Structure 1
């Protein structure tokens, strides 16, 4: 009926579809604030979270992330005991902040119990499809048992899903269905929402409740992070940009004189190992990047420049005030180096 007619009405934008419009500024990049408050008990000095993936974040990454002012989410592909131990390892390293991923399973509360005993700062109820009754029920259950626990729930890509998770008791909503570098959800299932639109739609709803959103996935360059925050996210979550730094789990492997690390979807064959569901992610390799610090300095540096250009003395200004301009593929081609043969790779390109 009405739904038949509306089938093709909506349009969505992703990072490469837009640029931020420069505005009047009296702030230099080095003077801007990149601090962000997710809740009364979860305040970050930089708006970056490392993904809860088995090739991105265990304790060493979470420690390094927290020291940089961000947050690491310890992944769930390990025993309850192992995960609680990893969380504890971060906490004893100076009381740094740490998060931990939990799936929607029968043993989820048991896992959460142990993580809370280990002093975890946030639980991520991490699911392929956040807008499901199973997730909502689990959030309600956790919130009822743990009234003060930071609950990040996702992933979602619509205002309605956002509303549903907030009402169930989530105090942070994680946004992103299909944008991940290692993701095949869009190809396998045909499902997704271009990430900038997802963030904006979800932020529009979350704003109404004073709830922050995390822009998760699809960020390839520091400028994409600026765009995600300007689209309304309080913070971003990164997988590929952190895979391959020294502190990520996994060994550095050498092939034809170059150092690589494995990076894979949590929905890839190998990760799911560690009718039945078909994979929704791939396994790959990324160049070894060296220490996390060097990568974070480039990311935050890019954000500082973007904020300076937008006249954003802080992230709240950026979310509330920054404006985009839409462009075509031709626009995109102009927006990367062109017609010159690059001889040195830059630290941020």
Structure 2
């Protein structure tokens, strides 16, 4: 309904920083707020998945997250499957200057994937009592999905900027048949990323166990600057949640919508749930953990592209343990600790008893939410500033 100019129309899309949540007609104690989600047969108390990023998730973090009631995804195309000991490599990435990290990563990530390390990472996480969740790009799945199946991973994430049931490739590159993959894999398969109703619906029809929503909102993402592609998160989430609801009516199958990236605070999580997300996928808030493999740094997994980097490396620092970050007690005033407590406290304030009710809360378009009254916080770099 918007005219850009003669013969070119558009629709308005809203970002995470443009919306706010409105109380209902009841309130509830946060201890009564049910935050569960489920993917396949796996129920989780914390509706947070740590991103498949080398500054965020290694084997230890995947286990720690699982034990807290959350999940972490190991990237099978990152350093974890290229080096038997990733630690010196992670140290090098964290130690070089702002003008050196692109070139360094272009080199370090050229070391080949060792399929024996795909098996090892999965089996060590499972041996330790963790849920083993692993990612591959569509081309990576053409080569290694059978290795993941043989290893017996609990969840497979096929994730890239876009993942399509209608991908055109030169005949030398094996395009991935997502319908065949979902049917043949012995575990649930999460597909993404997408930002539209039409694509999310197609991914669900192909057999996805969950869909990942988001193109470019990430803190370490440069895709929107490199390509111009993206839909801001509230709008993308709502459109994909509508596809979930239509797919549920058509088949009786519930495919959760995961809002992926661009989340820093508990308020950001809540705003994503209120737009329809069943769960969120976050990286930068978890890269701030004492146990995070990034050593206080966080980088995009397309930063090492040898031809066109589409991520950067940022310094997020280290603010607490992963336990403090997910379940507190919070040590900070900015909503970046005790993320589960923040979700339950927000649901309580809004009267939302469970995640489905949270997705039904009233929303306002409120670009002044993060700026009204905040001049001192911005000037002094405190609180929200």
Residues 142 and 20 of structure 1, relative CA distance in 2, 3 Å threshold: same
1:340 is displaced (CA, Å) by 5.8
Q: Does 1:84 pair with 2:84?
A: no
Match of 1:70 in 2: 70
Q: Distance in 2 between matches of 1:6 and 1:294?
A: 53
> What is the 5 A alignment of 1:46-125?
46-76=46-76, 77=78, 78=81, 79-94=114-129, 96-105=130-139, 108-125=141-158
Range moving further from structure 2, 5-14 or 223-232: 5-14
Structure 1: 5+ residue stretches without partners: 253-260
Structure 2: 5+ residue stretches without partners: 82-113, 169-174, 248-253, 328-337
Q: Distance in 1 between matches of 2:313 and 2:256?
A: 31
> What is the 5 A alignment of 1:1-349?
7-39=8-40, 41-76=41-76, 77=78, 78=81, 79-94=114-129, 96-105=130-139, 108-131=141-164, 133-134=166-167, 137-146=176-185, 148-209=186-247, 210-250=254-294, 252=295, 261-269=296-304, 272=305, 276=307, 278-297=308-327, 298-319=338-359, 321-328=360-367, 330-334=368-372, 337-339=374-376
Residues 138 and 5 of structure 1, relative CA distance in 2, 3 Å threshold: farther
Deviations 1:299-335 (CA, angstroms, capped at 9, x unpaired): 111101110011011111112x21101113x34311x
Q: Aligned with 1:85: secondary structure?
A: helix
Q: Distance in 1 between matches of 2:59 and 2:156?
A: 15
Provide the TM-score with structure 1 as the length reference: 0.86
The answer as to whether partners of 1:57 and 1:74 remain within 8 angstroms in 2 is: yes
The alignment of Structure 1 onto Structure 2 pairs a total of residues equal to 326
1:244 is displaced (CA, Å) by 2.9
Residues 6 and 12 of structure 1, relative CA distance in 2, 3 Å threshold: farther
Q: Distance in 1 between matches of 2:316 and 2:9?
A: 37
Residues 162 and 46 of structure 1, relative CA distance in 2, 3 Å threshold: same
The answer as to whether partners of 2:59 and 2:74 remain within 8 angstroms in 1 is: yes
Q: Distance in 2 between matches of 1:178 and 1:27?
A: 35
The answer as to whether partners of 1:62 and 1:98 remain within 8 angstroms in 2 is: yes
Q: Aligned with 1:56: secondary structure?
A: coil
CA RMSD of aligned residues (A): 2.6
Match of 2:99 in 1: none
Residues 190 and 132 of structure 1, relative CA distance in 2, 3 Å threshold: farther
Q: Distance in 2 between matches of 1:99 and 1:340?
A: 39
Provide the TM-score with structure 2 as the length reference: 0.78
